[PDB]
Design a protein around this nucleic acid. Structure first.
Length: 198
DNA sequence: CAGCTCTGTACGTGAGCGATGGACAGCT
DNA sequence: AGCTGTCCATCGCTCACGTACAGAGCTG
């Protein structure tokens, strides 16, 4: 019944979740749109069932199990930042229109060209499908997860796609089913950093 | 025909919320 | 022993920042 401690869903729809972006980041996690719990909390991925923080720990991207309250520590401590394709608070990915997504893509690509992280991680396959068509003018028959073959225009930022950390998708039913992509992201990060160090 | 886009629908886990009722102590 | 109320284990149900895919409609 009451999931928001007496706060209405209509009020949460007016709230926004701030980005956590700085220069020289290794990774920027790009969500689809903040959900009601993130709007409520004012922090990234607070959903008790969301797999994000558990996959970050299980993959070794964090040495201890962190939570949504740690999100502002991620740039300085781990080289990780956060943004979303669509800024607007939304219950789920199915409530977003094509226009909202394409407006989001344009704003997103400008953010990435400003902050130029080593890797732009799309936390959700649906947003990369829109982004690729809008930014690179490419629609492939079978879009795959993992490292994509185009850099953000005018930057060296790579594009890496993972299934959404939301526990809504049945195709990757557990955090265990998504951790392969976080491990591969860690490996890609370590390789990029090692190449720059040498 | 055939390949495309668009829309509707079905799908596995694990966490939380409200209801239920057994266990149990305080009281007389 | 009988009564009463709280605690809390446990259950059923819902559902979470989606995704894959069939099939209708469209177009070359």
């Amino acid at each position: 019944v009451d999931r928001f401690n007496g706060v209405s869903e209509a009020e949460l729809l007016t709230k926004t979740l701030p980005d956590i972006l700085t220069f020289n980041l290794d990774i920027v996690i790009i969500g689809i749109a903040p959900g009601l719990m993130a709007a409520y909390k004012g922090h990234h991925y607070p959903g008790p069932g969301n797999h994000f923080w558990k996959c970050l720990f299980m993959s070794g991207l964090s040495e201890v199990q962190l939570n949504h309250m740690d999100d502002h520590t991620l740039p300085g401590k781990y080289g990780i930042g956060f943004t979303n394709m669509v800024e607007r608070t939304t219950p789920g990915s199915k409530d977003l229109s094509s226009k909202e997504f394409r407006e989001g893509g344009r704003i997103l690509v400008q953010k990435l060209q400003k902050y130029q992280p080593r890797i732009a991680v799309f936390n959700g396959k649906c947003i990369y499908e829109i982004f690729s068509k809008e930014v690179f003018g490419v629609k492939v028959k079978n879009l795959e997860f993992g490292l994509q073959p185009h850099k953000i225009p005018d930057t060296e930022t790579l594009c890496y796609v993972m299934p959404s950390s939301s526990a809504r998708c049945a195709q990757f039913p557990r955090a265990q089913d998504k951790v392969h992509y976080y491990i591969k992201l860690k490996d890609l990060r370590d390789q990029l950093k090692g190449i720059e160090r040498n």
